[PDB]
Amino acid sequence: VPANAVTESDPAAVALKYHRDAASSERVAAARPGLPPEEQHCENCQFMNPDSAAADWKGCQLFPGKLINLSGWCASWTLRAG
Amino acid sequence: VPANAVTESDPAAVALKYHRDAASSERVAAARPGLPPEEQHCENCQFMNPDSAAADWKGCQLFPGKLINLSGWCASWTLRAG
Ligand code: SF4
Ligand code: SF4
């Protein structure tokens, strides 16, 4: 929707395996540590920028100037510190 | 040197912990799998774009339009497939 939203065809997105819907991602296979794969989303990711965008479209450290979907996922998923 | 070279102060670089010289990085601590930390550099990283730039300054999938140093390192280090 937002013109600056990261596309799944964007080369950097493809490299990272980003998907607007975490259900379409290889997260169960990646088996990244921190939380069960099913629980892994941009919403609880360390690199997500909540002070960026509006609504479901917040920002991400790996995609400067662009917006990821809070329900998405990518291979760099890291549980938000706290 | 190249105007498009990724700076260590660049926000995305800081997030990823990128360092022009892999010796200045937290690679021994990160203990990423694939090759001994000492052996980890952009030169043997999966996301490095060799067909981009010239000399020591080649490209990287995580830094679109920018150039990383082949001797560098960042937390996303992944041994080049092959
Ligand atoms: S690093 Fe995190 S916030 Fe960014 S696209 Fe990936 S899963 Fe989402
Ligand atoms: S992902 Fe690889 S090529 Fe890119 S800055 Fe990092 S260590 Fe270097």
Side-chain angles (χ1 to χ4, degrees), chain A residues 1-16 18-23 25-42 44-50 52-55 57-65 67-82, chain B residues 1-16 18-23 25-42 44-50 52-55 57-65 67-82:
Chain A
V1 213
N4 61 327
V6 181
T7 47
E8 281 147 275
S9 62
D10 181 308
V14 168
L16 290 176
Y18 167 83
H19 278 290
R20 248 103 94 135
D21 185 12
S25 68
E26 310 286 86
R27 68 191 175 155
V28 49
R32 302 223 74 202
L35 237 45
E38 306 82 50
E39 268 59 74
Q40 304 180 352
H41 294 102
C42 286
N44 56 16
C45 178
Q46 157 62 31
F47 309 113
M48 182 271 291
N49 285 165
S52 258
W57 303 103
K58 298 302 213 291
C60 177
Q61 293 268 241
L62 308 189
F63 298 97
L67 293 178
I68 49 84
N69 198 300
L70 287 181
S71 299
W73 186 93
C74 84
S76 283
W77 186 93
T78 293
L79 176 58
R80 220 170 166 71
Chain B
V1 213
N4 61 327
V6 181
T7 47
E8 281 147 275
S9 62
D10 181 308
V14 168
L16 290 176
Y18 167 83
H19 278 290
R20 248 103 94 135
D21 185 12
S25 68
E26 310 286 86
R27 68 191 175 155
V28 49
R32 302 223 74 202
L35 237 45
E38 306 82 50
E39 268 59 74
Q40 304 180 352
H41 294 102
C42 286
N44 56 16
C45 178
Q46 157 62 31
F47 309 113
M48 182 271 291
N49 285 165
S52 258
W57 303 103
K58 298 302 213 291
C60 177
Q61 293 268 241
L62 308 189
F63 298 97
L67 293 178
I68 49 84
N69 198 300
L70 287 181
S71 299
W73 186 93
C74 84
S76 283
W77 186 93
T78 293
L79 176 58
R80 220 170 166 71

PDB file of all heavy atoms in Angstrom, chain A residues 13-49, unseen atoms left out:
ATOM      1  N   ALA A  13      15.199  -7.695  -0.441  1.00  0.00           N
ATOM      2  CA  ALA A  13      14.129  -8.453   0.204  1.00  0.00           C
ATOM      3  C   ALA A  13      14.269  -9.910  -0.176  1.00  0.00           C
ATOM      4  O   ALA A  13      14.133 -10.795   0.663  1.00  0.00           O
ATOM      5  CB  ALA A  13      12.782  -7.944  -0.235  1.00  0.00           C
ATOM      6  N   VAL A  14      14.521 -10.156  -1.454  1.00  0.00           N
ATOM      7  CA  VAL A  14      14.699 -11.511  -1.948  1.00  0.00           C
ATOM      8  C   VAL A  14      15.880 -12.171  -1.234  1.00  0.00           C
ATOM      9  O   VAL A  14      15.786 -13.326  -0.812  1.00  0.00           O
ATOM     10  CB  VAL A  14      14.922 -11.522  -3.488  1.00  0.00           C
ATOM     11  CG1 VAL A  14      15.390 -12.894  -3.948  1.00  0.00           C
ATOM     12  CG2 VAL A  14      13.616 -11.139  -4.217  1.00  0.00           C
ATOM     13  N   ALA A  15      16.986 -11.437  -1.104  1.00  0.00           N
ATOM     14  CA  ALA A  15      18.189 -11.938  -0.432  1.00  0.00           C
ATOM     15  C   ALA A  15      17.887 -12.326   0.995  1.00  0.00           C
ATOM     16  O   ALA A  15      18.370 -13.340   1.481  1.00  0.00           O
ATOM     17  CB  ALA A  15      19.275 -10.889  -0.439  1.00  0.00           C
ATOM     18  N   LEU A  16      17.136 -11.479   1.684  1.00  0.00           N
ATOM     19  CA  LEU A  16      16.770 -11.730   3.068  1.00  0.00           C
ATOM     20  C   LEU A  16      15.577 -12.666   3.209  1.00  0.00           C
ATOM     21  O   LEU A  16      15.307 -13.150   4.303  1.00  0.00           O
ATOM     22  CB  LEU A  16      16.484 -10.412   3.792  1.00  0.00           C
ATOM     23  CG  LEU A  16      17.694  -9.515   4.046  1.00  0.00           C
ATOM     24  CD1 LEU A  16      17.231  -8.206   4.692  1.00  0.00           C
ATOM     25  CD2 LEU A  16      18.693 -10.246   4.935  1.00  0.00           C
ATOM     26  N   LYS A  17      14.876 -12.924   2.109  1.00  0.00           N
ATOM     27  CA  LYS A  17      13.710 -13.814   2.113  1.00  0.00           C
ATOM     28  C   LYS A  17      12.491 -13.220   2.820  1.00  0.00           C
ATOM     29  O   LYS A  17      11.657 -13.950   3.378  1.00  0.00           O
ATOM     30  CB  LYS A  17      14.065 -15.174   2.733  1.00  0.00           C
ATOM     31  CG  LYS A  17      15.150 -15.912   1.985  1.00  0.00           C
ATOM     32  CD  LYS A  17      15.638 -17.112   2.759  1.00  0.00           C
ATOM     33  CE  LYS A  17      16.746 -17.832   2.000  1.00  0.00           C
ATOM     34  N   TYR A  18      12.385 -11.896   2.762  1.00  0.00           N
ATOM     35  CA  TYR A  18      11.287 -11.163   3.375  1.00  0.00           C
ATOM     36  C   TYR A  18       9.953 -11.499   2.694  1.00  0.00           C
ATOM     37  O   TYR A  18       9.894 -11.737   1.492  1.00  0.00           O
ATOM     38  CB  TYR A  18      11.589  -9.658   3.318  1.00  0.00           C
ATOM     39  CG  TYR A  18      10.419  -8.769   3.636  1.00  0.00           C
ATOM     40  CD1 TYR A  18      10.078  -8.476   4.948  1.00  0.00           C
ATOM     41  CD2 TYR A  18       9.628  -8.243   2.618  1.00  0.00           C
ATOM     42  CE1 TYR A  18       8.961  -7.676   5.242  1.00  0.00           C
ATOM     43  CE2 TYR A  18       8.523  -7.455   2.899  1.00  0.00           C
ATOM     44  CZ  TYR A  18       8.192  -7.174   4.214  1.00  0.00           C
ATOM     45  OH  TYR A  18       7.092  -6.397   4.486  1.00  0.00           O
ATOM     46  N   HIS A  19       8.891 -11.544   3.486  1.00  0.00           N
ATOM     47  CA  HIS A  19       7.545 -11.844   3.010  1.00  0.00           C
ATOM     48  C   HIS A  19       6.578 -10.988   3.819  1.00  0.00           C
ATOM     49  O   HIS A  19       6.644 -10.979   5.049  1.00  0.00           O
ATOM     50  CB  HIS A  19       7.214 -13.318   3.241  1.00  0.00           C
ATOM     51  CG  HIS A  19       7.733 -14.292   2.231  1.00  0.00           C
ATOM     52  ND1 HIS A  19       7.240 -14.376   0.946  1.00  0.00           N
ATOM     53  CD2 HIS A  19       8.708 -15.227   2.320  1.00  0.00           C
ATOM     54  CE1 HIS A  19       7.885 -15.320   0.289  1.00  0.00           C
ATOM     55  NE2 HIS A  19       8.781 -15.853   1.101  1.00  0.00           N
ATOM     56  N   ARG A  20       5.686 -10.268   3.143  1.00  0.00           N
ATOM     57  CA  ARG A  20       4.726  -9.417   3.842  1.00  0.00           C
ATOM     58  C   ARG A  20       3.919 -10.209   4.867  1.00  0.00           C
ATOM     59  O   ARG A  20       3.501  -9.670   5.886  1.00  0.00           O
ATOM     60  CB  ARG A  20       3.790  -8.724   2.853  1.00  0.00           C
ATOM     61  CG  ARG A  20       3.990  -7.229   2.778  1.00  0.00           C
ATOM     62  CD  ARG A  20       4.761  -6.820   1.541  1.00  0.00           C
ATOM     63  NE  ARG A  20       3.869  -6.453   0.444  1.00  0.00           N
ATOM     64  CZ  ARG A  20       4.024  -5.373  -0.320  1.00  0.00           C
ATOM     65  NH1 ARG A  20       5.041  -4.545  -0.116  1.00  0.00           N
ATOM     66  NH2 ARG A  20       3.157  -5.109  -1.287  1.00  0.00           N
ATOM     67  N   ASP A  21       3.671 -11.482   4.568  1.00  0.00           N
ATOM     68  CA  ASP A  21       2.922 -12.359   5.468  1.00  0.00           C
ATOM     69  C   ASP A  21       3.878 -13.445   5.961  1.00  0.00           C
ATOM     70  O   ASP A  21       4.359 -14.258   5.171  1.00  0.00           O
ATOM     71  CB  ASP A  21       1.730 -12.983   4.722  1.00  0.00           C
ATOM     72  CG  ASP A  21       0.810 -13.820   5.629  1.00  0.00           C
ATOM     73  OD1 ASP A  21       0.923 -13.767   6.875  1.00  0.00           O
ATOM     74  OD2 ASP A  21      -0.047 -14.544   5.082  1.00  0.00           O
ATOM     75  N   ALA A  22       4.164 -13.447   7.256  1.00  0.00           N
ATOM     76  CA  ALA A  22       5.081 -14.429   7.814  1.00  0.00           C
ATOM     77  C   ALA A  22       4.673 -15.866   7.508  1.00  0.00           C
ATOM     78  O   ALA A  22       5.483 -16.777   7.619  1.00  0.00           O
ATOM     79  CB  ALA A  22       5.230 -14.224   9.305  1.00  0.00           C
ATOM     80  N   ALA A  23       3.414 -16.076   7.143  1.00  0.00           N
ATOM     81  CA  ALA A  23       2.930 -17.418   6.813  1.00  0.00           C
ATOM     82  C   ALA A  23       3.488 -17.951   5.487  1.00  0.00           C
ATOM     83  O   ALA A  23       3.488 -19.160   5.247  1.00  0.00           O
ATOM     84  CB  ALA A  23       1.413 -17.428   6.775  1.00  0.00           C
ATOM     85  N   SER A  24       3.923 -17.042   4.619  1.00  0.00           N
ATOM     86  CA  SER A  24       4.471 -17.407   3.316  1.00  0.00           C
ATOM     87  C   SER A  24       5.984 -17.605   3.368  1.00  0.00           C
ATOM     88  O   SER A  24       6.607 -17.922   2.354  1.00  0.00           O
ATOM     89  CB  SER A  24       4.193 -16.297   2.300  1.00  0.00           C
ATOM     90  N   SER A  25       6.582 -17.356   4.529  1.00  0.00           N
ATOM     91  CA  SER A  25       8.028 -17.469   4.692  1.00  0.00           C
ATOM     92  C   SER A  25       8.586 -18.823   5.144  1.00  0.00           C
ATOM     93  O   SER A  25       7.864 -19.677   5.658  1.00  0.00           O
ATOM     94  CB  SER A  25       8.513 -16.382   5.643  1.00  0.00           C
ATOM     95  OG  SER A  25       8.048 -16.612   6.959  1.00  0.00           O
ATOM     96  N   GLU A  26       9.891 -19.000   4.927  1.00  0.00           N
ATOM     97  CA  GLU A  26      10.628 -20.212   5.298  1.00  0.00           C
ATOM     98  C   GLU A  26      11.113 -20.111   6.754  1.00  0.00           C
ATOM     99  O   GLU A  26      12.249 -20.470   7.060  1.00  0.00           O
ATOM    100  CB  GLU A  26      11.844 -20.376   4.376  1.00  0.00           C
ATOM    101  CG  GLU A  26      11.548 -20.270   2.881  1.00  0.00           C
ATOM    102  CD  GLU A  26      10.842 -21.493   2.317  1.00  0.00           C
ATOM    103  OE1 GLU A  26       9.599 -21.555   2.387  1.00  0.00           O
ATOM    104  OE2 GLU A  26      11.531 -22.389   1.788  1.00  0.00           O
ATOM    105  N   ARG A  27      10.250 -19.615   7.639  1.00  0.00           N
ATOM    106  CA  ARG A  27      10.600 -19.436   9.047  1.00  0.00           C
ATOM    107  C   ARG A  27      10.644 -20.710   9.857  1.00  0.00           C
ATOM    108  O   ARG A  27      11.408 -20.808  10.819  1.00  0.00           O
ATOM    109  CB  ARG A  27       9.672 -18.429   9.729  1.00  0.00           C
ATOM    110  CG  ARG A  27       8.232 -18.867   9.888  1.00  0.00           C
ATOM    111  CD  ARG A  27       7.368 -17.697  10.316  1.00  0.00           C
ATOM    112  NE  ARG A  27       5.959 -18.069  10.349  1.00  0.00           N
ATOM    113  CZ  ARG A  27       5.048 -17.467  11.105  1.00  0.00           C
ATOM    114  NH1 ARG A  27       5.400 -16.458  11.888  1.00  0.00           N
ATOM    115  NH2 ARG A  27       3.795 -17.896  11.104  1.00  0.00           N
ATOM    116  N   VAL A  28       9.772 -21.654   9.529  1.00  0.00           N
ATOM    117  CA  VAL A  28       9.751 -22.925  10.234  1.00  0.00           C
ATOM    118  C   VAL A  28      11.016 -23.702   9.875  1.00  0.00           C
ATOM    119  O   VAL A  28      11.538 -24.465  10.686  1.00  0.00           O
ATOM    120  CB  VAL A  28       8.482 -23.737   9.896  1.00  0.00           C
ATOM    121  CG1 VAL A  28       8.275 -23.810   8.381  1.00  0.00           C
ATOM    122  CG2 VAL A  28       8.574 -25.129  10.499  1.00  0.00           C
ATOM    123  N   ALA A  29      11.519 -23.477   8.665  1.00  0.00           N
ATOM    124  CA  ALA A  29      12.728 -24.140   8.193  1.00  0.00           C
ATOM    125  C   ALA A  29      13.976 -23.440   8.717  1.00  0.00           C
ATOM    126  O   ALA A  29      14.953 -24.080   9.079  1.00  0.00           O
ATOM    127  CB  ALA A  29      12.746 -24.174   6.675  1.00  0.00           C
ATOM    128  N   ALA A  30      13.955 -22.116   8.730  1.00  0.00           N
ATOM    129  CA  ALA A  30      15.096 -21.348   9.216  1.00  0.00           C
ATOM    130  C   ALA A  30      15.406 -21.702  10.676  1.00  0.00           C
ATOM    131  O   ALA A  30      16.574 -21.740  11.079  1.00  0.00           O
ATOM    132  CB  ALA A  30      14.823 -19.858   9.076  1.00  0.00           C
ATOM    133  N   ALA A  31      14.350 -21.946  11.457  1.00  0.00           N
ATOM    134  CA  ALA A  31      14.456 -22.310  12.872  1.00  0.00           C
ATOM    135  C   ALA A  31      15.322 -21.344  13.669  1.00  0.00           C
ATOM    136  O   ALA A  31      16.138 -21.760  14.505  1.00  0.00           O
ATOM    137  CB  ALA A  31      14.974 -23.745  13.026  1.00  0.00           C
ATOM    138  N   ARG A  32      15.138 -20.051  13.414  1.00  0.00           N
ATOM    139  CA  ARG A  32      15.897 -19.034  14.114  1.00  0.00           C
ATOM    140  C   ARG A  32      15.555 -19.144  15.579  1.00  0.00           C
ATOM    141  O   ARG A  32      14.427 -19.471  15.932  1.00  0.00           O
ATOM    142  CB  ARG A  32      15.552 -17.652  13.595  1.00  0.00           C
ATOM    143  CG  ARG A  32      15.789 -17.493  12.116  1.00  0.00           C
ATOM    144  CD  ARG A  32      16.454 -16.175  11.835  1.00  0.00           C
ATOM    145  NE  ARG A  32      17.861 -16.183  12.226  1.00  0.00           N
ATOM    146  CZ  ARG A  32      18.577 -15.090  12.489  1.00  0.00           C
ATOM    147  NH1 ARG A  32      18.015 -13.890  12.430  1.00  0.00           N
ATOM    148  NH2 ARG A  32      19.856 -15.193  12.827  1.00  0.00           N
ATOM    149  N   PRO A  33      16.548 -18.939  16.454  1.00  0.00           N
ATOM    150  CA  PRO A  33      16.342 -19.027  17.898  1.00  0.00           C
ATOM    151  C   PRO A  33      15.724 -17.789  18.531  1.00  0.00           C
ATOM    152  O   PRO A  33      15.859 -16.675  18.017  1.00  0.00           O
ATOM    153  CB  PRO A  33      17.755 -19.261  18.408  1.00  0.00           C
ATOM    154  CG  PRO A  33      18.562 -18.412  17.493  1.00  0.00           C
ATOM    155  CD  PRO A  33      17.971 -18.714  16.140  1.00  0.00           C
ATOM    156  N   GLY A  34      15.089 -17.996  19.679  1.00  0.00           N
ATOM    157  CA  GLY A  34      14.479 -16.898  20.398  1.00  0.00           C
ATOM    158  C   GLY A  34      13.033 -17.128  20.778  1.00  0.00           C
ATOM    159  O   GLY A  34      12.639 -16.924  21.927  1.00  0.00           O
ATOM    160  N   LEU A  35      12.252 -17.596  19.816  1.00  0.00           N
ATOM    161  CA  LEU A  35      10.829 -17.835  20.005  1.00  0.00           C
ATOM    162  C   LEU A  35      10.412 -18.855  18.944  1.00  0.00           C
ATOM    163  O   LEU A  35      11.074 -18.986  17.915  1.00  0.00           O
ATOM    164  CB  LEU A  35      10.085 -16.512  19.767  1.00  0.00           C
ATOM    165  CG  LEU A  35       9.172 -15.869  20.810  1.00  0.00           C
ATOM    166  CD1 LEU A  35       9.802 -15.895  22.184  1.00  0.00           C
ATOM    167  CD2 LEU A  35       8.880 -14.454  20.374  1.00  0.00           C
ATOM    168  N   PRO A  36       9.333 -19.616  19.188  1.00  0.00           N
ATOM    169  CA  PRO A  36       8.915 -20.594  18.180  1.00  0.00           C
ATOM    170  C   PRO A  36       8.708 -19.884  16.829  1.00  0.00           C
ATOM    171  O   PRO A  36       8.250 -18.741  16.789  1.00  0.00           O
ATOM    172  CB  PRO A  36       7.593 -21.107  18.750  1.00  0.00           C
ATOM    173  CG  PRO A  36       7.795 -21.008  20.212  1.00  0.00           C
ATOM    174  CD  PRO A  36       8.430 -19.652  20.351  1.00  0.00           C
ATOM    175  N   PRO A  37       9.033 -20.560  15.713  1.00  0.00           N
ATOM    176  CA  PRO A  37       8.879 -19.978  14.376  1.00  0.00           C
ATOM    177  C   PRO A  37       7.513 -19.359  14.171  1.00  0.00           C
ATOM    178  O   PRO A  37       7.383 -18.295  13.585  1.00  0.00           O
ATOM    179  CB  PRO A  37       9.081 -21.182  13.457  1.00  0.00           C
ATOM    180  CG  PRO A  37      10.075 -21.996  14.197  1.00  0.00           C
ATOM    181  CD  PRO A  37       9.539 -21.943  15.618  1.00  0.00           C
ATOM    182  N   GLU A  38       6.495 -20.045  14.662  1.00  0.00           N
ATOM    183  CA  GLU A  38       5.122 -19.579  14.536  1.00  0.00           C
ATOM    184  C   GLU A  38       4.950 -18.195  15.149  1.00  0.00           C
ATOM    185  O   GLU A  38       4.131 -17.402  14.694  1.00  0.00           O
ATOM    186  CB  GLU A  38       4.176 -20.572  15.213  1.00  0.00           C
ATOM    187  CG  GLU A  38       4.319 -22.026  14.729  1.00  0.00           C
ATOM    188  CD  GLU A  38       5.466 -22.787  15.392  1.00  0.00           C
ATOM    189  OE1 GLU A  38       5.568 -22.774  16.641  1.00  0.00           O
ATOM    190  OE2 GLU A  38       6.254 -23.419  14.663  1.00  0.00           O
ATOM    191  N   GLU A  39       5.733 -17.918  16.186  1.00  0.00           N
ATOM    192  CA  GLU A  39       5.679 -16.639  16.897  1.00  0.00           C
ATOM    193  C   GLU A  39       6.540 -15.540  16.306  1.00  0.00           C
ATOM    194  O   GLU A  39       6.428 -14.385  16.699  1.00  0.00           O
ATOM    195  CB  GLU A  39       6.061 -16.835  18.363  1.00  0.00           C
ATOM    196  CG  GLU A  39       4.887 -17.109  19.295  1.00  0.00           C
ATOM    197  CD  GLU A  39       4.089 -18.343  18.924  1.00  0.00           C
ATOM    198  OE1 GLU A  39       4.582 -19.467  19.150  1.00  0.00           O
ATOM    199  OE2 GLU A  39       2.956 -18.183  18.422  1.00  0.00           O
ATOM    200  N   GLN A  40       7.366 -15.894  15.335  1.00  0.00           N
ATOM    201  CA  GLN A  40       8.261 -14.938  14.701  1.00  0.00           C
ATOM    202  C   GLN A  40       7.619 -14.008  13.664  1.00  0.00           C
ATOM    203  O   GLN A  40       7.089 -14.450  12.646  1.00  0.00           O
ATOM    204  CB  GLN A  40       9.447 -15.691  14.096  1.00  0.00           C
ATOM    205  CG  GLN A  40      10.172 -16.545  15.117  1.00  0.00           C
ATOM    206  CD  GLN A  40      11.339 -17.307  14.546  1.00  0.00           C
ATOM    207  OE1 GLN A  40      11.566 -17.332  13.333  1.00  0.00           O
ATOM    208  NE2 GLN A  40      12.096 -17.942  15.422  1.00  0.00           N
ATOM    209  N   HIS A  41       7.681 -12.711  13.937  1.00  0.00           N
ATOM    210  CA  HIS A  41       7.141 -11.679  13.051  1.00  0.00           C
ATOM    211  C   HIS A  41       7.958 -10.404  13.210  1.00  0.00           C
ATOM    212  O   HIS A  41       8.749 -10.275  14.136  1.00  0.00           O
ATOM    213  CB  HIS A  41       5.696 -11.339  13.416  1.00  0.00           C
ATOM    214  CG  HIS A  41       4.727 -12.455  13.190  1.00  0.00           C
ATOM    215  ND1 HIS A  41       4.243 -13.237  14.215  1.00  0.00           N
ATOM    216  CD2 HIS A  41       4.136 -12.906  12.060  1.00  0.00           C
ATOM    217  CE1 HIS A  41       3.397 -14.125  13.727  1.00  0.00           C
ATOM    218  NE2 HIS A  41       3.312 -13.945  12.421  1.00  0.00           N
ATOM    219  N   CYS A  42       7.729  -9.446  12.319  1.00  0.00           N
ATOM    220  CA  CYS A  42       8.431  -8.177  12.394  1.00  0.00           C
ATOM    221  C   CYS A  42       8.000  -7.484  13.680  1.00  0.00           C
ATOM    222  O   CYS A  42       8.780  -6.753  14.293  1.00  0.00           O
ATOM    223  CB  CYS A  42       8.115  -7.288  11.179  1.00  0.00           C
ATOM    224  SG  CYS A  42       8.891  -7.761   9.585  1.00  0.00           S
ATOM    225  N   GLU A  43       6.772  -7.748  14.117  1.00  0.00           N
ATOM    226  CA  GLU A  43       6.266  -7.123  15.336  1.00  0.00           C
ATOM    227  C   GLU A  43       7.163  -7.322  16.560  1.00  0.00           C
ATOM    228  O   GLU A  43       7.247  -6.438  17.410  1.00  0.00           O
ATOM    229  CB  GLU A  43       4.835  -7.577  15.634  1.00  0.00           C
ATOM    230  CG  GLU A  43       4.694  -9.055  15.909  1.00  0.00           C
ATOM    231  CD  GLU A  43       3.258  -9.465  16.136  1.00  0.00           C
ATOM    232  N   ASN A  44       7.814  -8.476  16.669  1.00  0.00           N
ATOM    233  CA  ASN A  44       8.705  -8.717  17.800  1.00  0.00           C
ATOM    234  C   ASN A  44      10.162  -8.878  17.392  1.00  0.00           C
ATOM    235  O   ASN A  44      10.930  -9.557  18.073  1.00  0.00           O
ATOM    236  CB  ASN A  44       8.250  -9.914  18.652  1.00  0.00           C
ATOM    237  CG  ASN A  44       8.109 -11.193  17.856  1.00  0.00           C
ATOM    238  OD1 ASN A  44       8.604 -11.313  16.743  1.00  0.00           O
ATOM    239  ND2 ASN A  44       7.408 -12.158  18.431  1.00  0.00           N
ATOM    240  N   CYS A  45      10.545  -8.191  16.321  1.00  0.00           N
ATOM    241  CA  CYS A  45      11.903  -8.244  15.814  1.00  0.00           C
ATOM    242  C   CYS A  45      12.714  -7.059  16.314  1.00  0.00           C
ATOM    243  O   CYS A  45      12.208  -5.943  16.449  1.00  0.00           O
ATOM    244  CB  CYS A  45      11.906  -8.279  14.289  1.00  0.00           C
ATOM    245  SG  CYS A  45      13.549  -8.293  13.513  1.00  0.00           S
ATOM    246  N   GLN A  46      13.983  -7.326  16.581  1.00  0.00           N
ATOM    247  CA  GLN A  46      14.920  -6.348  17.089  1.00  0.00           C
ATOM    248  C   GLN A  46      15.164  -5.185  16.138  1.00  0.00           C
ATOM    249  O   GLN A  46      15.368  -4.058  16.580  1.00  0.00           O
ATOM    250  CB  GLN A  46      16.238  -7.063  17.409  1.00  0.00           C
ATOM    251  CG  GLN A  46      17.478  -6.198  17.433  1.00  0.00           C
ATOM    252  CD  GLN A  46      17.427  -5.126  18.482  1.00  0.00           C
ATOM    253  OE1 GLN A  46      16.820  -5.315  19.524  1.00  0.00           O
ATOM    254  NE2 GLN A  46      18.045  -3.985  18.203  1.00  0.00           N
ATOM    255  N   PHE A  47      15.162  -5.455  14.836  1.00  0.00           N
ATOM    256  CA  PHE A  47      15.435  -4.412  13.842  1.00  0.00           C
ATOM    257  C   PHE A  47      14.224  -3.605  13.365  1.00  0.00           C
ATOM    258  O   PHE A  47      14.358  -2.737  12.512  1.00  0.00           O
ATOM    259  CB  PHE A  47      16.171  -5.008  12.630  1.00  0.00           C
ATOM    260  CG  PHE A  47      17.383  -5.827  12.988  1.00  0.00           C
ATOM    261  CD1 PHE A  47      17.399  -7.195  12.762  1.00  0.00           C
ATOM    262  CD2 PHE A  47      18.492  -5.243  13.579  1.00  0.00           C
ATOM    263  CE1 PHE A  47      18.499  -7.964  13.129  1.00  0.00           C
ATOM    264  CE2 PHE A  47      19.589  -6.010  13.945  1.00  0.00           C
ATOM    265  CZ  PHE A  47      19.588  -7.369  13.719  1.00  0.00           C
ATOM    266  N   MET A  48      13.048  -3.904  13.893  1.00  0.00           N
ATOM    267  CA  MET A  48      11.844  -3.190  13.502  1.00  0.00           C
ATOM    268  C   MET A  48      11.856  -1.783  14.118  1.00  0.00           C
ATOM    269  O   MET A  48      12.224  -1.602  15.280  1.00  0.00           O
ATOM    270  CB  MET A  48      10.616  -3.993  13.932  1.00  0.00           C
ATOM    271  CG  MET A  48       9.282  -3.390  13.559  1.00  0.00           C
ATOM    272  SD  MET A  48       8.612  -2.262  14.813  1.00  0.00           S
ATOM    273  CE  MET A  48       8.215  -3.379  16.127  1.00  0.00           C
ATOM    274  N   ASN A  49      11.481  -0.785  13.324  1.00  0.00           N
ATOM    275  CA  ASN A  49      11.442   0.610  13.770  1.00  0.00           C
ATOM    276  C   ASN A  49       9.999   1.061  13.966  1.00  0.00           C
ATOM    277  O   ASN A  49       9.368   1.581  13.044  1.00  0.00           O
ATOM    278  CB  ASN A  49      12.120   1.519  12.743  1.00  0.00           C
ATOM    279  CG  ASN A  49      13.633   1.404  12.762  1.00  0.00           C
ATOM    280  OD1 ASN A  49      14.307   1.853  11.838  1.00  0.00           O
ATOM    281  ND2 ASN A  49      14.177   0.843  13.835  1.00  0.00           N
TER     282      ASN A  49
END
